[PDB]
Design a protein around this nucleic acid. Structure first.
Lengths: 101, 136, 117, 34, 56, 142
RNA sequence: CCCGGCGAGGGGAGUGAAAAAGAACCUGAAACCGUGUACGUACAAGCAGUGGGAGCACGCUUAGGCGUGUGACUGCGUACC
RNA sequence: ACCGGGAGAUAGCU
RNA sequence: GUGAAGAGGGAAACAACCCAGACCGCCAGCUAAGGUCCCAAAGUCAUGGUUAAGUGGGAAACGCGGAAGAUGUAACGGGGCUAAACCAUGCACCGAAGCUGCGGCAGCGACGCUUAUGCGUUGUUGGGUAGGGGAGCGUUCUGUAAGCCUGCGAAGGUGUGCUGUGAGGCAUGCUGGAGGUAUCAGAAGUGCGAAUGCUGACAUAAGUAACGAUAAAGCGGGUGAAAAGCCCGCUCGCCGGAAGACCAAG
RNA sequence: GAACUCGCUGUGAAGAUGCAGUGUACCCGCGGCAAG
C-alpha cells in the first residue's frame, strides 16, 4: 500500500535540508531512523519527523507487516518566502513516499 | 492623472495616462440627400427584384390583440416581416410591440438598416403611393 | 477597444521555443538568447544544405580514387578512360557500386584502361 | 445576402502602419530615416 | 573582482558534488540492554559495554 | 537512397609489416599516414577509420637525403619557465628512433581524437623481431 | 481516528459533483528549483550549433530498415543591437 | 531650505 | 571597381588582393581564380635544364657577398620535401551559391485562342541599407446574431498530426465546468527585443567573509519534548568621578 | 548576452582563451602566491 507524507512551511533552507534527505532515498527505514537520530544537521529533526509520520500512517492505514516497508521516493522543494528589511527567509517543503514494493 | 528622472505618472510607468488617450468624439458624418435617395431606390429595386416584397391593400387588425396579429402572420406563411404602412394604426402598433421580429413604423420612418436587416417587408397601397410621392 | 496581447505573445514564444529543443540549457529556455540561437541554427542549416553536395562529392571522389588505386590506376586516368569510352556514369553510382560489388568495378576499370589509349 | 454588402474594390485602404515590425517594409524610425 | 558573466548550473553542480556527507553506518548494539548505539559512547538508556552508569 | 557508411565495429583491419632499411623518411611517412587513414581501401570513410594495423621495423635505418643530416632538428616545448630544451635529431635517433618515427607520423597524421585513435594503431620497433606474430602479419612493401 | 509537542503540519473515514475545490481555498504557463524515466560523458580544447552519423530503449507496416529520446565521432562555423 | 502650480515650461543631443 | 547596401570561393586567417552577382530545392555533370605528398580533393604526371644552397620557404641599395629580426624553426601553414623548389611547353583531374540537368514557385513584358477575361507558348527577372510602391495574417469591440457550436464539453494552458511563399490556420489526448462564435464589413488604447524603458516574481556570486568591542566565563539544579546564551544557586573575572543611581525630553 | 572560460606563433580600429597553424592536458574540490 503506497503511503505519502509531507510537511508545509518548514523553518529551514530549501537546499540545506536536501543534504540530509539524500541519505533516505533508497535506504530502508530500519537503519534510516537510526541514522537520522544520530545526524548532526538541524534538518535531521524534520527528516525524522516526516519519516515517523509516514511510518505511523503506513502502520495505521495498512494491516500489518510494517518492517518490510521500503523507502522509494523522497524530495524537497522551495516554499513561500518572507521579505524583511533586504533579507528573504526561505521555507522548505519535504515529501517522503514509502511503499512496501 | 492624479499625482505629483521622470514623473511616475508618465505613460511608460504604471497607473499612468496613455500616450494618445481617446477623447469624447463623434464618429457620425454627413450624408447628402442625393446619395441617400439613390441608395434607397437601389435597395428597394433589389428587394423587389428578389421577390421579397408583398403588398396588401388592407392589413388592419380589428382589436389590439397580439393573438390576432400572430394568427394573421401565420396565415400569410411569413415569419420575418417588417410591416411598414403609410399611416400608423394604434391597435396594430400596440399588438406588434411584444413580437420583436414584427416591427411597425410610420411613413417617414424609413431607414436603410430596417430595409437591409429585415428579410421581408410588407406595405400597403397607401404606403407605396406615399413613398412614391416622397423622395422616391 | 483595448486588446490584450498576452495570448499572441505566449503563442509566439511557444512556437519559437518549440524549435529550441536541446540547446545546452539557457538557449533552449531563455527567449532572449533562444531567438538568436535558432536564427544562427537556421543560418548554419542554410549553409550546410548547400555544403552537403560538396561533402558528398568529396566522399565519392575519395572512394573512387581508393578503388582505382586498388585496381592499379590513378583517379584521373580512370576518369579519362571512362570519358573516352562514351560513358556518363555519375561518381555517386560508381562509389555506391564499388563497395557492394567488385566484379562490376573491375570490368569498368578494365574498359577505362582499354579506352584510355 | 445581408453580409454580401462590401466596399467597392479600391475604395478603402488600411494604410501602412509605421513602426510595426521589420517585414512590413519600413522598419524602425517610422520610415523617415535618421 | 567582478563577475564578467553568470556561471551556469552545471558548474555549481560540479562544485557542490563534494558537499554530500556520509552516514555513520556503525551502529553498535548494547551487550545486555540490546539497543543500537554509537560506538564508544553512552547509550540513551545509560549503558556502555553492558556496565551500568548513573544514567540520570 | 542513402550512401553506405562504414561501420566502426565491423570494419576488418589486418596487420602489414613494413621495413624501410634505407628509404626516404618523407615517402615512408606519407605512405604510412595514407595507409593508416584507410584512403587506399575502397570503403574509405572520414567518419570512422578503416585502416590496417602497421608495424615498423628498423626505425634507425631510415634514410635522409641532403643537408638534413645536420640541419634538421626536433624541438618539443619543455614547459615551466625557459623550456627551450631542444633535441637534435641525431641524438634522438641514436637514443630511441621510435620517438622520431612516431612524432613524424603524428605530424603527418591529422591531429585530433580520431588522429590519436589512428596513432594508437601504429607501433614502431627498432629490432627486426616482432612480438605481434600471433596475428599472422602479412608482408607488404612500400 | 492516528502520527504529532495538549502546537504547526500531515494521512485515513465521511460530507462534498469535484477536497487534481480545505480557509495560502476558480482555471494555474514561463523565468527558479526538485525526484523518477530513455541516452551520452571522466584522453577530451574555442559563440556549444549545423548536415553526415554507428550505437544505445520503445511502439509501429507484428521484421521489410517508419518515428520518437540522446548523440561517440566527423567537414564547416570569431553572439544581438 | 521644503511643498502645489505656470509646466507635458524651451534648444541641442543620446 | 568594392564596401556603404553581395553573399560564394582562393591566398594560413585579413575591410581594401584575385576569381566571382545568392528565386527555392535536388546524394547529377562541366568550368572561373586557385590547386593535384598528406592534413585537406585531385598527376608523388610527361619532356630539357637550373637549383646540393633547406636558397626555395625574408629582406634592399651597392660591389657570390650584401643576410642581422621577430625570444620557438616561428617569415614554407605543420609535418615533411633533393624534387614534394624554379624556369618553358603539353594533357588530365579537383575546384564557388559560376554554368548546365531536373523539379516547384512570385513578377516582367511579347505573342496569339482574344475573351467570359482566363488560357497556351514565350525569353527574361527574383542579393540588397535608406527610401518608395503593391499584396496579406493575427486580437479585442459593434451589425450581420432570438442564426450556429457548446455540461455528449468553449475559452486559457499543455502535446501530437495535417496544411500554406507567409504573418499563420484546422482535427485531436490531458485538469477545466460556462461561454464562444461562421461569413462579410466598420471601428482600434492593436503585433516588443535592447531606450542605464517601468510594476511584480525569480537565479549568479554562496553556503561565501561576517555574525558588529578583544571585560572572560564555568559548574549543579529547575521549567520545557527539545536548554551555556530560558530560570535559581554556587566558583572566578570586568567596570566600579563607571559599564554605578536619579531627573528634563521622547 | 550566453559558455564545453588552456599556452605559443602569425593576422587583428595595433598585447586574442573564442580568428589560422601548432603543443599540452583524467573529471571535480581545498589553502595560499596577485601576472591579467
Amino acid at each position: 500500500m503506497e503511503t505519502i507524507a509531507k510537511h508545509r512551511h518548514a523553518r529551514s533552507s530549501a537546499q540545506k535540508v536536501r543534504l540530509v534527505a539524500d541519505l533516505i532515498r533508497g535506504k530502508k527505514v530500519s537503519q534510516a531512523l537510526d541514522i537520522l537520530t544520530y545526524t548532526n544537521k538541524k534538518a535531521a529533526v524534520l527528516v525524522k519527523k516526516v519519516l515517523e509520520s509516514a511510518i505511523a500512517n503506513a502502520e495505521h492505514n495498512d494491516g500489518a507487516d510494517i518492517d518490510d516497508l521500503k523507502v522509494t521516493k523522497i524530495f524537497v522543494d522551495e516554499g513561500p518566502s518572507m521579505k524583511r528589511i533586504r533579507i528573504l527567509k526561505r521555507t522548505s517543503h519535504i515529501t517522503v513516499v514509502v511503499s512496501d514494493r | 492623472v492624479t499625482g505629483s528622472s521622470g514623473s511616475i505618472k508618465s505613460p511608460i510607468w504604471r497607473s499612468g495616462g496613455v500616450t494618445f488617450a481617446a477623447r469624447p468624439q463623434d464618429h457620425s458624418q454627413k450624408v447628402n440627400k442625393k446619395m441617400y435617395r439613390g441608395a434607397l431606390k437601389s435597395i428597394l429595386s433589389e428587394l423587389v427584384r428578389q421577390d421579397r416584397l408583398i403588398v396588401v391593400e388592407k392589413f388592419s387588425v380589428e382589436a389590439p390583440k397580439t393573438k390576432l396579429l400572430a394568427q394573421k402572420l401565420k396565415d400569410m406563411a411569413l415569419e420575418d416581416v417588417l410591416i411598414i404602412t403609410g399611416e400608423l394604426d394604434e391597435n396594430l402598433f400596440l399588438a406588434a410591440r411584444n413580437l420583436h421580429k414584427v416591427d411597425v413604423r410610420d411613413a417617414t420612418g424609413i431607414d436603410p438598416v430596417s430595409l437591409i436587416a429585415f428579410d421581408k417587408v410588407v406595405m400597403t397601397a397607401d404606403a407605396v403611393k406615399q413613398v412614391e410621392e416622397m423622395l422616391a | 477597444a483595448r486588446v490584450k496581447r498576452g495570448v499572441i505573445a505566449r503563442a509566439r514564444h511557444k512556437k519559437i521555443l518549440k524549435q529550441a529543443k536541446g540547446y545546452y540549457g539557457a538557449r533552449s529556455r531563455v527567449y532572449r538568447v533562444a531567438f538568436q540561437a535558432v536564427i544562427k541554427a537556421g543560418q548554419y542549416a542554410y549553409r550546410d544544405r548547400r555544403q552537403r553536395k560538396r561533402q558528398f562529392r568529396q566522399l565519392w571522389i575519395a572512394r573512387i580514387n581508393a578503388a582505382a588505386r586498388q585496381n592499379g590506376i590513378s583517379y584521373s586516368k580512370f576518369i579519362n578512360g571512362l570519358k573516352k569510352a562514351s560513358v556518363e556514369i555519375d561518381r555517386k553510382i560508381l562509389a555506391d557500386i564499388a563497395v557492394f560489388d567488385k566484379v562490376a568495378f573491375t570490368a569498368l576499370v578494365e574498359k577505362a584502361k582499354a579506352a584510355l589509349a | 445576402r445581408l453580409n454580401t454588402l462590401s466596399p467597392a474594390e479600391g475604395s478603402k485602404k488600411a494604410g501602412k502602419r509605421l513602426g510595426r515590425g521589420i517585414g512590413s517594409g519600413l522598419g524602425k524610425t517610422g520610415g523617415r530615416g535618421h | 573582482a567582478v563577475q564578467q558573466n553568470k556561471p551556469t548550473r552545471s558548474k555549481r553542480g560540479m562544485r557542490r558534488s563534494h558537499d554530500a556527507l556520509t552516514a555513520v553506518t556503525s551502529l553498535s548494539v548494547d551487550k545486555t540492554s540490546g539497543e543500537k548505539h554509537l560506538r564508544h559512547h553512552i547509550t540513551a538508556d545509560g549503558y556502555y559495554r553492558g556496565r551500568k552508569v548513573i544514567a540520570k | 537512397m542513402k550512401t553506405f557508411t562504414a561501420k566502426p565495429e565491423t570494419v576488418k583491419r589486418d596487420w602489414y609489416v613494413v621495413d624501410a632499411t634505407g628509404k626516404t623518411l618523407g615517402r615512408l611517412a606519407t605512405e604510412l599516414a595514407r595507409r593508416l587513414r584507410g584512403k587506399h581501401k575502397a570503403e574509405y570513410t572520414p567518419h570512422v577509420d578503416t585502416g590496417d594495423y602497421i608495424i615498423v621495423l628498423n626505425a634507425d635505418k631510415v634514410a635522409v637525403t641532403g643537408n638534413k643530416r645536420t640541419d634538421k632538428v626536433y624541438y618539443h616545448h619543455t614547459g615551466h619557465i625557459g623550456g627551450i630544451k631542444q633535441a637534435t635529431f641525431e641524438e634522438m635517433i641514436a637514443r630511441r628512433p621510435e620517438r622520431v618515427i612516431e612524432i613524424a607520423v603524428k605530424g603527418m597524421l591529422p591531429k585530433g581524437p580520431l588522429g590519436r585513435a589512428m596513432f594508437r594503431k601504429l607501433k614502431v620497433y627498432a629490432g627486426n623481431e616482432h612480438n605481434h606474430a600471433a596475428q599472422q602479419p602479412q608482408v607488404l612493401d612500400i
